[PDB]
Amino acid sequence: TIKEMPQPKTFGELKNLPLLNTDKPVQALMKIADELGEIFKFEAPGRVTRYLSSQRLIKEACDESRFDKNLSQALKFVRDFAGDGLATSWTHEKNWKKAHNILLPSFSQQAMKGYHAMMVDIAVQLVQKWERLNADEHIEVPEDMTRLTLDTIGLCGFNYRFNSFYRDQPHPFITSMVRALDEAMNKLQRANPDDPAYDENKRQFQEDIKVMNDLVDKIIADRKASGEQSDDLLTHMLNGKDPETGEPLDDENIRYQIITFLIAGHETTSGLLSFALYFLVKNPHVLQKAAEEAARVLVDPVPSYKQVKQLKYVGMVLNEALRLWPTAPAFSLYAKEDTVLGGEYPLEKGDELMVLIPQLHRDKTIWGDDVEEFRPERFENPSAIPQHAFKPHGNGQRACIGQQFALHEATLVLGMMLKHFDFEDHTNYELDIKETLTLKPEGFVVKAKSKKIPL
Ligand code: HEM
Numbered sequence: 001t002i003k004e005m006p007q008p009k010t011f012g013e014l015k016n017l018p019l020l021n022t023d024k025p026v027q028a029l030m031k032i033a034d035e036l037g038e039i040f041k042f043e044a045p046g047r048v049t050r051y052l053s054s055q056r057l058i059k060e061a062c063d064e065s066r067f068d069k070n071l072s073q074a075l076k077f078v079r080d081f082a083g084d085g086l087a088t089s090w091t092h093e094k095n096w097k098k099a100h101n102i103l104l105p106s107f108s109q110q111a112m113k114g115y116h117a118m119m120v121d122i123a124v125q126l127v128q129k130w131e132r133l134n135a136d137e138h139i140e141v142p143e144d145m146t147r148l149t150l151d152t153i154g155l156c157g158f159n160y161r162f163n164s165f166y167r168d169q170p171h172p173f174i175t176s177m178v179r180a181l182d183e184a185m186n187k188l189q190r191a192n193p194d195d196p197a198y199d200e201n202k203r204q205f206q207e208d209i210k211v212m213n214d215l216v217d218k219i220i221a222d223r224k225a226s227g228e229q230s231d232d233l234l235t236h237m238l239n240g241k242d243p244e245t246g247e248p249l250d251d252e253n254i255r256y257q258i259i260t261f262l263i264a265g266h267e268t269t270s271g272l273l274s275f276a277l278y279f280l281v282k283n284p285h286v287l288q289k290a291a292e293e294a295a296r297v298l299v300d301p302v303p304s305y306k307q308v309k310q311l312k313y314v315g316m317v318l319n320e321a322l323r324l325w326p327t328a329p330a331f332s333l334y335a336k337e338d339t340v341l342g343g344e345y346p347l348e349k350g351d352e353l354m355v356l357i358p359q360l361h362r363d364k365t366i367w368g369d370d371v372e373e374f375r376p377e378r379f380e381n382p383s384a385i386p387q388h389a390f391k392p393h394g395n396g397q398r399a400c401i402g403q404q405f406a407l408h409e410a411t412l413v414l415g416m417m418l419k420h421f422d423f424e425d426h427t428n429y430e431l432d433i434k435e436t437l438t439l440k441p442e443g444f445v446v447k448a449k450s451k452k453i454p455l
C-alpha cells in the first residue's frame with residue numbers, strides 16, 4: 001500500500017526553498033499542510049525532508065527505537081554559537097549524554113524548591129512595575145514577559161541580575177540574540193550563503209555572537225571569584241561529575257551550555273506567557289475561572305512552592321496555550337534504519353522528518369471539531385489523550401530538559417498576575433505572530449486594573 005506523498009510548488013533548481021522566503025515560514029508551512037494533508041515532501045538543493053502533521057504518523061515518528069533527533073538546518077545554524085550544548089548536539093556525541101547526566105539533577109523537584117524564592121523575586125518586580133503604571137498607560141506584553149523570563153533564568157541559574165526591569169530598551173544580550181535568530185531564520189532560504197552580498201550579514205552575525213560570549217565571560221568570572229556559596233545550575237556545570245564517563249564538563253562545553261540555557265531557558269517561556277494572556281483576555285470565562293483559583297490558593301503575600309503546585313487550572317491554561325501555539329514550533333528526526341511509516345511511506349536509513357507541532361495540535365481526529373477553541377478542560381484527564389497527540393516539549397530522551405522549570409515559572413507568574421490585576425483588551429488586538437525560529441505575539445498590548453492587594 002505504498003503511497004506517493006504530495007509536494008508543494010517548486011522553483012526550478014531551487015526546488016521548494018523559496019517557499020521559506022517569508023518572515024513567517026512556520027505559518028506558511030501550516031498553510032501548506034492545510035492544503036496537502038498529513039505528510040508532504042520538501043526539497044532544497046542537496047536536501048530532502050518530510051513534514052508530518054497528523055497524530056497517526058507522528059506517534060510512529062516518536063518511537064525512539066526507529067527515529068533519533070536530527071539537527072534541522074535551523075539548529076545547525078544555531079550551533080554556530082551554541083556548539084555542542086544540550087540542544088544542538090547529536091545524541092551520539094559524547095557531550096550530549098555526559099551533560100545530560102550532569103545537569104538533570106538541576107531540574108529535580110528538590111532543585112525547583114531551591115529556585116522558587118528567586119523566581120518570586122523577579123515576579124514581584126513584574127507586579128510592582130504594573131502597579132506603578134499611570135491611568136490609561138498600557139502594558140507591552142511580550143516585551144515585559146521577556147524581561148521576566150530572561151531575568152529569571154539569569155538569577156535562578158547563574159546568580160546574575162540582568163535587571164531588565166531597569167531598562168526601557170532590551171538588554172544587549174536580547175538585542176544580539178534576536179538578531180542572531182533572525183539571521184539564522186533568514187539564512188534558511190539563502191541559496192548562495194557565501195555570495196559577497198552577505199558579507200555584512202556575516203560580520204553582524206559574528207558581532208552578535210561576541211556580545212553573547214562577552215556576557216558569558218562575566219557570568220563565569222563573577223562566580224569563580226564570588227565568596228557566596230551557590231547551589232544552582234552553574235554550580236552543577238562547574239562541579240558535577242558524569243556517573244557514566246566519570247568526567248566533569250570542560251570549559252569549552254560549559255560556555256556552550258550557558259549560551260544554550262540563557263536562550264532556551266527564557267525565549268520560549270516568554271512566548272508561552274504572552275500567548276496565555278492573549279487567550280485569557282479573549283476568553284473572559286476562562287480568565288474568571290483561573291482568577292478564582294488564584295484567589296483561593298494564593299492566600300499569602302508571597303506565593304510558596306506548595307501553593308504553585310496547587311494552581312492546577314492555571315496549569316491547564318498553560319497547556320492549552322501550548323496546544324494552539326507551541327513556542328518551539330518544530331523538531332526534526334532521522335530514521336535509524338529502513339522502516340515504513342504508517343504502512344504507506346517507506347523510508348531509508350538516514351531519511352529525515354520534520355514534526356510540525358502547531359498542525360499536529362490541530363488534528364481534528366484527536367481534539368474534535370472545536371479544535372480552534374481555547375478550552376483548558378481538554379487536559380483534565382491525560383489518560384483520555386491518545387499517545388503523542390501533544391508534543392510542545394519534544395520527544396523521548398531528547399525532550400526539553402527545562403519543562404518543569406518553565407511550567408513552574410509560568411504557573412507562578414500567571415497566578416500572581418491573576419491575583420493582583422483585572423485585564424482589558426482595550427485595542428481589540430488582532431493576533432500577529434512574529435517568527436524568530438521561535439513564535440511570539442507581536443504588538444500585543446493590554447491595560448491592567450489593580451485589585452489593590454498588597455505584596
Ligand atoms: C514553554 C517553554 C519551553 C518550550 C515550549 C520548550 C520546548 C522545547 C522543545 C520542543 C525541545 C526539543 C527540541 C528538539 O527536539 O530539537 C526543547 C529542548 C530543550 N530545552 Fe526547552 N522548552 C521550553 C523551555 C525551556 C527552558 C526554560 C529551558 C531551560 C531551563 C529549556 C532547555 C532546553 C534544553 C537544554 C533542550 C535540549 C534538551 C536535550 O536534548 O538534552 N527549555 N525544548
Ligand SMILES: CCCCCCCN1CCC[C@H]1C(=O)N[C@@H](Cc1ccccc1)C(=O)O
Nearest residue numbers: 025026044072073074188328329330437438
Ligand atoms: C529553536 C526552536 C525551534 C527550531 C525549529 C526550527 C523550525 N524552522 C523554523 C523556520 C521553519 C522551520 C523549519 O521547518 N525548518 C527547516 C527548514 C528547511 C527545510 C528543508 C530544507 C531547508 C530548510 C529546517 O530548519 O531544516
Ligand SMILES: C=Cc1ccccc1
Nearest residue numbers: 078087263264267438
Ligand atoms: C531548544 C532549542 C532552542 C533554540 C533556540 C531558541 C530556543 C530554543
